[PDB]
Write a protein that binds this ligand. Structure first.
Ligand code: HEC
Length: 112
């Protein structure tokens, strides 16, 4: 389970640098930031998957229709393709809970 074992707040400082070194290659998170390889993530926590305007998503991500929160985000980041088979996000995954917690802490702050 997720709504059992998952998110506990971590370091936003650390999470910002994990976003830079691991996610920035394909995504922006600031308000008004553009879509790149991956879509802009501003407001992601208040949204279902495959909904940013102007981005070409896979049919799988749309169909999955996940309402993003800390728990589903934690699962997707662990192994994106295991969580949404057919997704085109090419990211090996963040296997350590500590790393995922730092990153999500950062993301929930920056995406609002
Ligand atoms: C390029 C090599 C990527 C890296 C590095 C990361 N992501 Fe990504 N992401 C990428 C693509 C091409 C897509 C769309 C996938 C599809 O199947 O259509 C995504 C999607 C996401 C999403 C879903 C967004 C939505 O609007 O539903 C999220 C939440 C997301 N990506 C987050 C994310 C994070 C936090 C990353 C760093 C650990 C990261 N991605 C890496 C491409 C790439």
């Amino acid at each position: 389970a997720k709504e059992s074992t998952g998110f506990k707040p971590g370091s936003a400082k650390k999470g910002a640098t994990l976003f830079k070194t691991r996610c920035q290659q394909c995504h922006t998170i600031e308000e008004g930031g553009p879509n790149k390889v991956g879509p802009n993530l501003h407001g992601i926590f208040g949204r279902h998957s495959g909904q940013v305007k102007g981005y070409s998503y896979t049919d799988a991500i749309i169909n999955k229709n996940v309402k993003w929160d800390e728990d589903s985000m934690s699962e997707y980041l662990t192994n994106p393709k295991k969580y949404i088979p057919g997704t085109k996000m090419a990211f090996a995954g963040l296997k350590k809970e500590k790393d995922r917690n730092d990153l999500i802490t950062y993301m929930t702050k920056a995406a609002k």
